[PDB]
Amino acid sequence: RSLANAPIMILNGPNLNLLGQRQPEIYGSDTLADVEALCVKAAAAHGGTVDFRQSNHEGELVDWIHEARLNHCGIVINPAAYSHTSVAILDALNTCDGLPVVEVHISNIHQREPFRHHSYVSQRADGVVAGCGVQGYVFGVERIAALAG
Amino acid sequence: RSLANAPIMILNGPNLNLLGQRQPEIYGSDTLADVEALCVKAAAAHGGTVDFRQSNHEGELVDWIHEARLNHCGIVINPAAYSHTSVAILDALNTCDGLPVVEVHISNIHQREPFRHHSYVSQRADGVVAGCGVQGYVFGVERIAALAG
Amino acid sequence: RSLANAPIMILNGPNLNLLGQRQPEIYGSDTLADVEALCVKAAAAHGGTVDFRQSNHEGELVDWIHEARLNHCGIVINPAAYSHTSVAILDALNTCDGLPVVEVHISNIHQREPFRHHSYVSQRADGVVAGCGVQGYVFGVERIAALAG
Amino acid sequence: RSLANAPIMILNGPNLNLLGQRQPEIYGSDTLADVEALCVKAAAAHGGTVDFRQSNHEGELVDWIHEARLNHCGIVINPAAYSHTSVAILDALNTCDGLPVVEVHISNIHQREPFRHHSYVSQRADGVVAGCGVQGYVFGVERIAALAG
Amino acid sequence: RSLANAPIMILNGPNLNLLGQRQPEIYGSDTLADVEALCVKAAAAHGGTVDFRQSNHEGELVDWIHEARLNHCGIVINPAAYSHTSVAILDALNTCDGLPVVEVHISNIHQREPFRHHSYVSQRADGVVAGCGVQGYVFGVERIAALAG
Amino acid sequence: RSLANAPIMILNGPNLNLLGQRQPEIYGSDTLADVEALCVKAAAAHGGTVDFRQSNHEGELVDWIHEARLNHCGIVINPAAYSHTSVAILDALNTCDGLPVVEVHISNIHQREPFRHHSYVSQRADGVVAGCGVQGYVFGVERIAALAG
Amino acid sequence: RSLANAPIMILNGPNLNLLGQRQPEIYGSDTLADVEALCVKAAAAHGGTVDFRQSNHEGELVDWIHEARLNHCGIVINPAAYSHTSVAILDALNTCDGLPVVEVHISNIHQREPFRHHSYVSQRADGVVAGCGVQGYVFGVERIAALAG
Amino acid sequence: RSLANAPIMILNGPNLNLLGQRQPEIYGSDTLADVEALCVKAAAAHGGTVDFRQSNHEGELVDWIHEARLNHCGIVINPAAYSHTSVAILDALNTCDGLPVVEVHISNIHQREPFRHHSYVSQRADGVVAGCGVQGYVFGVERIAALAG
Amino acid sequence: RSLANAPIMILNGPNLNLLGQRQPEIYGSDTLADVEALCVKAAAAHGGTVDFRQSNHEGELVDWIHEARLNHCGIVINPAAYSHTSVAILDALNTCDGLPVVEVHISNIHQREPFRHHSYVSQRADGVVAGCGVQGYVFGVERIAALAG
Amino acid sequence: RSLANAPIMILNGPNLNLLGQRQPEIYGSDTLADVEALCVKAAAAHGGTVDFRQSNHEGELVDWIHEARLNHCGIVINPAAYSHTSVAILDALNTCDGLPVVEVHISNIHQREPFRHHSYVSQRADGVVAGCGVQGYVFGVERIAALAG
Amino acid sequence: RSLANAPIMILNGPNLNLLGQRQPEIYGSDTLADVEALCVKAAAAHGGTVDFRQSNHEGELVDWIHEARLNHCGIVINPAAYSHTSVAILDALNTCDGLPVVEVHISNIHQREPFRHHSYVSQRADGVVAGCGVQGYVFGVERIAALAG
Amino acid sequence: RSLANAPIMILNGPNLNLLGQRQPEIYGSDTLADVEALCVKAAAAHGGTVDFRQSNHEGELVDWIHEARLNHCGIVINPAAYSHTSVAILDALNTCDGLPVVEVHISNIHQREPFRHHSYVSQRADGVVAGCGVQGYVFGVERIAALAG
Ligand SMILES: O=C(O)[C@]1(O)C=C(c2cccc(Sc3ccccc3)c2)[C@@H](O)[C@H](O)C1
Ligand SMILES: O=C(O)[C@]1(O)C=C(c2cccc(Sc3ccccc3)c2)[C@@H](O)[C@H](O)C1
Ligand SMILES: O=C(O)[C@]1(O)C=C(c2cccc(Sc3ccccc3)c2)[C@@H](O)[C@H](O)C1
Ligand SMILES: O=C(O)[C@]1(O)C=C(c2cccc(Sc3ccccc3)c2)[C@@H](O)[C@H](O)C1
Ligand SMILES: O=C(O)[C@]1(O)C=C(c2cccc(Sc3ccccc3)c2)[C@@H](O)[C@H](O)C1
Ligand SMILES: O=C(O)[C@]1(O)C=C(c2cccc(Sc3ccccc3)c2)[C@@H](O)[C@H](O)C1
Ligand SMILES: O=C(O)[C@]1(O)C=C(c2cccc(Sc3ccccc3)c2)[C@@H](O)[C@H](O)C1
Ligand SMILES: O=C(O)[C@]1(O)C=C(c2cccc(Sc3ccccc3)c2)[C@@H](O)[C@H](O)C1
Ligand SMILES: O=C(O)[C@]1(O)C=C(c2cccc(Sc3ccccc3)c2)[C@@H](O)[C@H](O)C1
Ligand SMILES: O=C(O)[C@]1(O)C=C(c2cccc(Sc3ccccc3)c2)[C@@H](O)[C@H](O)C1
């Protein structure tokens, strides 16, 4: 698919619903609809749209990767916690043959807890953006656009 | 919140619906409904009520820690197997700024298989109780009373 | 339960719905539907039937394992990526006192990524077939047949 | 050897003589005398007495463990720093057939330094209580009260 | 070579000569003769023959593997102790290009002593079957049937 | 300092001078001159200039991080190999208090040799981009331009 | 020193005062008094005399090795739990140049918990005996005789 | 089998043929002939005999262990290098339900190279003597005599 | 407290009482008495006094750190073996708030046995000095002077 | 070469040029220039002179080590970052048979990130001082005097 | 023994009988007869002869080292798989005091699976050549000649 | 390019400038200039010339390697200490497609400090020569001549 012909799937994993409500010194005060708004503007700036979701359930994120592989031109995914534990999500993205994928972490995970240092997604994520705050979704977006067409 | 306003959320993770039915030597012969009754008792004796729940679904448990965040005076969680795996629930509890959390295990995990040794949830549980059998959630309830009112 | 009296539960974990559609030199070219078919066949030859399911959700799998515990003669399981991350699954099958359980892998995970080398389910599962193709489902059904009898 | 006819032995390792002069944001405001008072109030709460002790010597705590074996009905122990070092104390508690043993940590040791996550005594203690404040000690006694008859 | 014109080589490694004088709780009551016999049946069932041997000698196993690389249609092997130690058999198997090879463990090694969890032979063995009791050989003969037929 | 008053220093480590001369599968066909010229255009588009440099010398990258410290509004750095070996550069970057720093990798380093998975610079770099190709440099300037504004 | 002139020192670490009263399937039914008597006899047997003592205190143990170093002809030592924790007794022992030392473990430690398989004592001790029953103390006596006379 | 009824099997592993010709600092200057002689002595003194062998071949030691299992009253073994590498030989010994095994090492393996620190044989041997020189064999024979009666 | 009014506590770990008496090629020929003389001179030069102690006993040192806590201007400790072993002495010293602590090793521990590389006391001591012989103490005194005045 | 005949090489590693320009809690507020002044002073107090240097470049420090090998009486070195990275600087100091080397870090590196805990240089430095601030330079000079002069 | 009066023993480990037959992108197109041929040619050139052997058996190889021990001027070995598993060949090679030992691998093992990275033999081999093709065998002869001549 | 068209680049890393001056038993009595003279001879002997260099500097060896990529027929390189620390250099050689690289260590690093055991360069070097003295340079040149001409 192209951006002209289909949306970017944007995917958000657990706890991100409450984004903007706390520890803004690590995550900022933008809320999750604030992020979504960025991504609409971001894709619009390039022709495309986005389809922005959030779930706290690993199987659903997996089900939405299944959909995107089929119906969308690329994925910007913040796996959030499942970044560090989900092989099922990684595997979901391994079936996405030549659908581009960007991982995105609002905080720089390399400077926080050692569990945080490692991510399964980065194994498939074509690129990975970290510590760019919610602007990094915007990079995820520009990247998807550059690649998809 | 106080004990007098809002109920202590009590959350139970995978397999625990089945508590009562096998391995007496490790887990006891009380069932989950009995556990729930022992908590009703304990909270009461301190002016409190409880919203006692179980689920096998990591994300639902996230959802519910989301709920208690707004609506309860504290959380008693037996994460069950999700203690050793779930960066998700760990993260959920961390959105619970201010609120007391007591993790409970029925078995002495420290005496068991290596992977049972670490709980992500103890990164955030205010208190941890292990191998005190089901009397352990009583301690939870007691300690939520202590910190709450 | 024995063979003639109840079904063998056959469980598939995440992404396997999708099997056949790529990387076949790792997975084969059989759909999940051909796998179910092979299974109906194998149970049949030994006078049994199968209760054959897939799910991308871990809790849904534990749920199904509770069911099997009650209603079925054994389990053949490909946990797909929870093999690796799911103490929840392990624990659920642990609750299955004298239920014959076989763990099945289409690929030989011991030749793959270091992180796939290890399975939680192998700690309970009675037998484990790896790298024997979709046919290991068939050995999976054969072994239950020998045990459930 | 019920709770009715023998004291609970209550042991405190190195440094705890000075409890309350520092880090009350970690260890509280209560002195050990105070703690000891809780212990008395908590044992009589359940129709028992306590024999409460503190020592900076590893071998004297070993000696007091052997004393409780013949003389006492249970042990409540916060082994302090020896928790992370003392196989002596572990081994002495091991000679303690039948006798109940709750291990106590006022602080959540799993939230502090990596060398504080592991406790030798945990490999024997029946209950391990942590992060529960000096109230962690009432729990210990409540747990002996329950097991000791 | 093919199933129709060459025996299946079946190699057994150290101590299997005594299989079934002791620890039936792990190995069953069937002798090595009984197992060869089962392999005689399962090979016929599929249009085949077997060349079943056993040696306590790591070098003779290599010797024999080299042989099968020309004389036999494939290899089922239970390396017994040399599984966890023999890079030399590993490497003998690696010279058997396009030859089918199933590794067989009667016990489930993943449920045993930790140094039994890793196999060298697994790195090359196309299929690995663990903890299926001697029936593991039949399965091993069946996959050779399938792949060599 | 802003892009307004000040050039964004963009620092490149060893072997970068050869960029676009072999292995285009990994690093591409764009060159070091080319890449700079993206940088120019990307700093232009956000009201700014670049100070774009390469070096094989760890000590001179250090010397250069000190320059910028006093004279530039930000650092975008692809440390190349020094990202994995260089405590000097990180300590350089840490002398850069209240200066924005963005680390770039052409490749996804998390998809490569295990020794490439860790970066020292990532303990200071506010943000980190990886496996977005030289676009990633553009992201780096976009982030610098943002933070300095 | 010789057996003629000077006793062999027999040192017993913590808990070994209780030897006899429990866990006989590991440590047996002989008592510390029984062992002393066993050792007097093995010394009498080979020309010598013993100075046989037992302590729960690491520093006393240490003190006594200093004494052995001036006044005695050998050290045979069961350090008990100290074998695994005590750098102090290791170095107490290293102060004893060309004094004979045999380390004694009633139990065979390479068969117990993993913390038990390492002894600091073994680093210096001339000989180490393990798993030979209280009889291994008679081997130390024997060994010291061989060495001192 | 008692001592009055069968020889004690003495097994010597690789390299020991040349015992005596070098590192008299670590091994002494008594040759194998000489060790063998010390054992004829030891056994006689205790009412018995020795069947004394040496092999550089791992499988040959297993053969002989299979043998002693049935024709002998017990094993004293110096596996030499194969203490560290041979799981096979470990399992040869496992098979000997109720036979007394004692492992001997002439040097103290806990003072040499880390790769010598660990022995697979120790996991079965009832006793281990290390660091007692050629006299350890003699302890091995006394231990068996003790046990074979 | 300052040099003027309170002695510098100088604590010496186990074994040091025998300082001088051997391996002067690692620790020198000065005796502990010589070192105390050094300390009395270094403090004198500074308008100070010292309180020079030595114990083999982990716990005694705990009591003396508690005594220095209220009665001295700083501490110069050589914990000797206890550096590497003793969390209590660490915890003890952490109780001395805003008291200058200097840790002193005579040998350079970073060149010895890998167990002697790590000191717990180094987590607290404001400063650590190794491999400067007995002169290290004198540096230890000078540092306290600098910091008690 | 002696204090009388030759200066002390005092060597400073990366980033130490900027000493006193930031985080004085951690490194103090003297400049490198101030430090120099102290060392001229400290060596004068003791009949000596100094050659005080700083460089960012691993290899030039190596050049300067080689130079001091032939020209100076000893080396006081603070290798900054290359303490932790630089085998070459260690190998260099290694070339200085018989020359006094003292390693100095201002901050107590053992109290920081794990990566600052190990120093290659500690492997050859005769003395190592850390956590004494800039005074520790003074001790290094004092140490060289005693060793040289 | 020099090259004039004695042949160099060239010892070849498991599987190398099959060199030529497969994987020439990894091991080369030449056979062992071909290698032997080189070795003859290279010894000839330095006035020496070679005694060239291959075994798949570990104790055989050990036998031939003991033989080379008294009858040859040096050893060249490609222990192939036993480089990574055989402490017994290492120890065999240790018995050869004064004998020049060169170890050779045709493949560059430090590029291979991570278990291929470590060779017991390299702990005793005076030189090790790896990944210089069958040519590495000639350097071996060359080196032995340097050292026996 | 061939041995006929261009010199062999011979790179010498840190500290090698001082060869001969110390550690003859480790490195020999040859000087750097002596080494070079062997290398010249070594190449003429094969109808080749050398370009022989040394530097203490990481980045300049990098620079030299880049020059060789253009101008030389191959690299012999003894990275010295940068062997264990330099991904810069590895990556410098990674740039050198189709250029024969031989790595040389005078000593056998696999016999030395555990950190010497690993070299990054070996990951790319076609061959590694070790412990062959400065004869390994001659072997390195040989190899290059084989590969290059
Ligand atoms: O930084 C991230 O984007 C990250 O991926 C996101 C995470 C995270 C952690 C806790 C909470 C939340 S959501 C949130 C953020 C701010 C306020 C409230 C909720 C996200 C973690 O799971 C990851 O480890 C890091
Ligand atoms: O939390 C505990 O109860 C703990 O067991 C007790 C400890 C401890 C550590 C230092 C001092 C003290 S005692 C104290 C506490 C607060 C103020 C004064 C003294 C206890 C640590 O040894 C353990 O790691 C944790
Ligand atoms: O399960 C297996 O087949 C296995 O390969 C078999 C093994 C084994 C272990 C001990 C003895 C024997 S043979 C035997 C079996 C039963 C009774 C007596 C001997 C095999 C182990 O060596 C392996 O770890 C696992
Ligand atoms: O991906 C990167 O940006 C990276 O920093 C760049 C690296 C790298 C590796 C080889 C060569 C070069 S520079 C180059 C690129 C293409 C052709 C020639 C040289 C960089 C590695 O040092 C790092 O792992 C990864
Ligand atoms: O086996 C030994 O002699 C050993 O020294 C003894 C130990 C030990 C452990 C617990 C208790 C005792 S003593 C004892 C034995 C039986 C009953 C009562 C006390 C010894 C362990 O600490 C060591 O791991 C090994
Ligand atoms: O100490 C032992 O008895 C030991 O079993 C014996 C060994 C050993 C090593 C090399 C040679 C020999 S035999 C020998 C002794 C002296 C000179 C020549 C050969 C034994 C090692 O393999 C073991 O780790 C330790
Ligand atoms: O180097 C030290 O000063 C140290 O603190 C002191 C130690 C030590 C070790 C053995 C003996 C002694 S004291 C001694 C010295 C010579 C003869 C007798 C006793 C100290 C080690 O425990 C520590 O690793 C390091
Ligand atoms: O503690 C030290 O002296 C150390 O040697 C010095 C270091 C260090 C770290 C950052 C900056 C500086 S220099 C500096 C000091 C103040 C302001 C600016 C730069 C030194 C680290 O490289 C080392 O890990 C530790
Ligand atoms: O590279 C080597 O020389 C090596 O020593 C040789 C080995 C090896 C492994 C399997 C087969 C062969 S020989 C061979 C070559 C081509 C076809 C068939 C067999 C060598 C491995 O055992 C070692 O890890 C590496
Ligand atoms: O052995 C080598 O060839 C080596 O390449 C060279 C090294 C080395 C180390 C210190 C000094 C020198 S050069 C030297 C050698 C002897 C006397 C003087 C200088 C080389 C080591 O760094 C490496 O670990 C190995």
Side-chain angles (χ1 to χ4, degrees), chain G residues 66 69 87-88 90-97, chain I residues 12-24 26-28 30 32 54 77-84 103-110 112-113 115-119 129-131 133 137:
Chain G
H66 299 169
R69 162 181 192 273
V87 187
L90 165 47
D91 311 343
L93 269 187
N94 293 300
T95 76
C96 297
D97 314 300
Chain I
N12 283 289
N15 291 317
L16 281 154
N17 45 296
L18 294 175
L19 190 68
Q21 292 186 247
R22 69 152 320 257
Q23 262 182 228
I26 307 282
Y27 313 90
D30 312 25
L32 188 64
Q54 188 283 351
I77 187 161
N78 182 347
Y82 294 153
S83 334
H84 316 294
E103 166 179 20
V104 164
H105 310 282
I106 302 172
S107 51
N108 186 311
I109 66 175
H110 308 288
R112 317 189 75 207
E113 301 77 64
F115 72 93
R116 309 198 189 264
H117 296 187
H118 339 262
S119 188
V129 170
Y137 286 88

Side-chain angles (χ1 to χ4, degrees), chain H residues 15-16 18-22 27 78 80-81 84 105-107 109 112 116, chain K residues 91 95:
Chain H
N15 300 305
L16 278 145
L18 314 161
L19 186 37
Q21 329 188 184
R22 89 179 277 255
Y27 297 111
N78 188 354
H84 320 302
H105 298 292
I106 299 174
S107 61
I109 64 170
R112 300 190 63 215
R116 316 184 177 286
Chain K
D91 285 333
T95 65

Side-chain angles (χ1 to χ4, degrees), chain K residues 102 107-108 110-111 117 119 122-136 138-140 142-144 146-147, chain L residues 102 107-108 110-111 117 119 122-136 138-140 142-144 146-147:
Chain K
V102 185
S107 70
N108 167 356
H110 312 296
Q111 283 177 2
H117 299 176
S119 190
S122 316
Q123 307 179 209
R124 166 58 182 80
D126 303 290
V128 199
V129 176
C132 307
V134 278
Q135 199 177 3
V138 179
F139 303 174
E142 255 163 36
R143 208 52 190 153
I144 296 286
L147 310 170
Chain L
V102 181
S107 79
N108 182 26
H110 307 292
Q111 245 159 40
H117 289 191
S119 147
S122 309
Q123 322 220 230
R124 166 60 183 79
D126 305 287
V128 207
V129 190
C132 297
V134 335
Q135 186 170 21
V138 152
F139 299 163
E142 266 167 27
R143 175 53 171 196
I144 297 287
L147 283 179

Side-chain angles (χ1 to χ4, degrees), chain D residues 13-15 78-86 116, chain I residues 86-89 91:
Chain D
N15 307 308
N78 170 0
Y82 287 151
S83 302
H84 321 294
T85 70
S86 188
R116 292 197 189 285
Chain I
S86 162
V87 170
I89 287 158
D91 280 327

Side-chain angles (χ1 to χ4, degrees), chain B residues 102 108 110-111 122-133 135 139-140 142-143 146, chain D residues 102 108 110-111 122-133 135 139-140 142-143 146:
Chain B
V102 184
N108 207 347
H110 304 303
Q111 265 169 321
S122 316
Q123 253 80 129
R124 168 54 174 107
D126 288 65
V128 191
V129 185
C132 281
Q135 194 177 6
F139 291 162
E142 290 178 354
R143 187 68 188 151
Chain D
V102 195
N108 190 345
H110 315 279
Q111 281 161 11
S122 298
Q123 321 188 189
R124 171 61 176 73
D126 300 289
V128 185
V129 178
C132 285
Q135 185 166 21
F139 302 162
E142 285 182 353
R143 190 58 187 176

Side-chain angles (χ1 to χ4, degrees), chain F residues 57 63 83 93 96 131 133 144:
Chain F
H57 300 246
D63 287 326
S83 56
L93 295 172
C96 287
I144 298 281

